[PDB]
Design a protein around this ligand. Sequence first.
Ligand SMILES: *[C@@H]1O[C@H](CO)[C@@H](O[C@@H]2O[C@H](CO)[C@@H](O)[C@H](O)[C@H]2NC(C)=O)[C@H](O)[C@H]1NC(C)=O
Ligand SMILES: [Fe+3]
Length: 653
Amino acid sequence: SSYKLCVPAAYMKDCEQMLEVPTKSKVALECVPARDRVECLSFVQQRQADFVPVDPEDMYVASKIPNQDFVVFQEYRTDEEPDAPFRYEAVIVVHKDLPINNLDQLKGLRSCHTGVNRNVGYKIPLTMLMKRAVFPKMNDHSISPKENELKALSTFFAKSCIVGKWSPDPKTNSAWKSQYSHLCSMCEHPERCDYPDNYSGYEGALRCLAHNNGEVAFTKVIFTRKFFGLPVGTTPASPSNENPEEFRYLCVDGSKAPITGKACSWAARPWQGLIGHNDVLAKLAPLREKVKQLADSGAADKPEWFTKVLGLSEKIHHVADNIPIKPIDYLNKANYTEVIERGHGAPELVVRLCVTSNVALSKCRAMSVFAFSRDIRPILDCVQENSEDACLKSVQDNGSDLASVDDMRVAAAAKKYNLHPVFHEVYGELKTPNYAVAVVKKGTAYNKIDDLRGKKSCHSSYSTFSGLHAPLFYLINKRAIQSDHCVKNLGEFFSGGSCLPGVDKDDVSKLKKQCGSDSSAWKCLEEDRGDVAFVSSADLSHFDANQYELLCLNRDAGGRDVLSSFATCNVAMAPSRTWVAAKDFLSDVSIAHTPLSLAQMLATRPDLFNIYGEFLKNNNVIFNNAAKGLATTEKLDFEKFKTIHDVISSCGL
Ligand SMILES: *[C@@H]1O[C@H](CO)[C@@H](O[C@@H]2O[C@H](CO)[C@@H](O)[C@H](O)[C@H]2NC(C)=O)[C@H](O)[C@H]1NC(C)=O
Ligand SMILES: [Fe+3]
């Protein structure tokens, strides 16, 4: 008989400290952990929890749960605008003398935007304008949905300022900034088209309009009012050099309205707040008093539970009780469901990820609904086969658009299904694939590969890339050993003997000769049973940084570098879990976009959706828990992986 608050598992301890905050309300709250907020909504519907903080995007996810009976019973507002129904209203701001009497006439104007993927300055304008025949269509399927929007904007407006990361892929973003440079010509620094830019953001858009001869600005009321020194909410009038009489809101009417009056606004971003199941009603006043009290006492400096558990913020923690409202009706009255459901015209593009298990299917579906609610496009669809090979076949057949493959199966999958890598996992704090490296003791006499001829080697297991593939390819490639009888010949290069676990299962007896009492590469190196250890960079924790170095077999100069420099002192880059796609359908940009937008949106917000976390007590579902990001696969890395595999297929290994 408590009010159960769902909380991302990572923040359970913070919710517990919160439960110790003294308050006048004696309401008992309990912390219910979930995998993330998306799961929390399921637990709320299922009554394992009673409420959870939500952004409007989360309410939308919540409104789609089959048979849902959610209720938004609490709004988080600002102290500046405690009585405003919406977080912020989107407005169109023009010079008073702009000849215009219809929103069709926004065409050809120089436009001032807050920045890409933002609400009043981008998503809302796109949502509303696209309803207008004069606005370019966005269903050209030779390119991605994101490119369709940018093409549409750069074709409708004469010039714009739309800064920021248009693509999560750096090279795609740069290429797009070149091809649609008109979208950056109104900015303070057009070549860069990124933050900081004095002509971007809520205020910079009005400066773009007032000071850089822009002709329309998409922004929000509060920055429009303050730009002109006008009062807003609790904020009083301010001295301003800008004169509001020279400017006007442009209304959907096509009419103009004074800035000094109530703004005409085509949509608003709704406030965040709390969502709960319908049985929270009736039991509703005591909870609201409890949350209000926690909000007003965490205001002072702001413990973790303030933001991570209650979903408040420094700027947004005025708890306002509303007339309880269903989530979609909450979103509707802001015109914000339209924005959340924005598309690009039929057929809406879909990227179909192939998964190999029921749990992965369910993770892909929860990820899809989240991505969609968060304005990431293409829509993610989920397709299930019963193996990796069947997912790969399906990508070939165009039953799917992408599928993952691990370790050294990427080159095989390309030979066999004519697929190619699109993006791969990166790891560590440096967000980097693993590398196969060559570990040596400090001060030993090896600086290049021929110096190790006749010597002894330690390896990771024969079944590993770094242990077997990379040293075998590295030697064969430099012709230090013939490519007939490769494993034997490897043994003949390290003629002093080697430990390559599992080489047993031609005459390969030399390659287990040094395994001694303990075949681990770090014990084998430590005990001078080998003079170099071919291991993965992922295993370098087993080597004392003060005693061991990397042999930079990759560098022209050879030599040595520290354990942490593996990314440039190595044998080969290691294939990480990789998603592959066919040749004749979605572009690599269209395929990479949604997963890399997820990875980058969720890198700091695993509480919203735990993309790399445990999923129903299963690890490494879709992504490995160790993944720290996603990057597009360079063609040259692809091509190198194919050559390595070709050498290994030659050896019959
Ligand atoms: C949501 O969108 C509708 C359609 O643009 C807006 O409807 C207008 O509402 C005004 C009141 O400001 C009415 O007087 C007009 O008749 C409506 N105009 C049109 C063109 O339909 C409404 O303003 C929007 N609501 C929000 C909160 O953004
Ligand atoms: Fe915004």
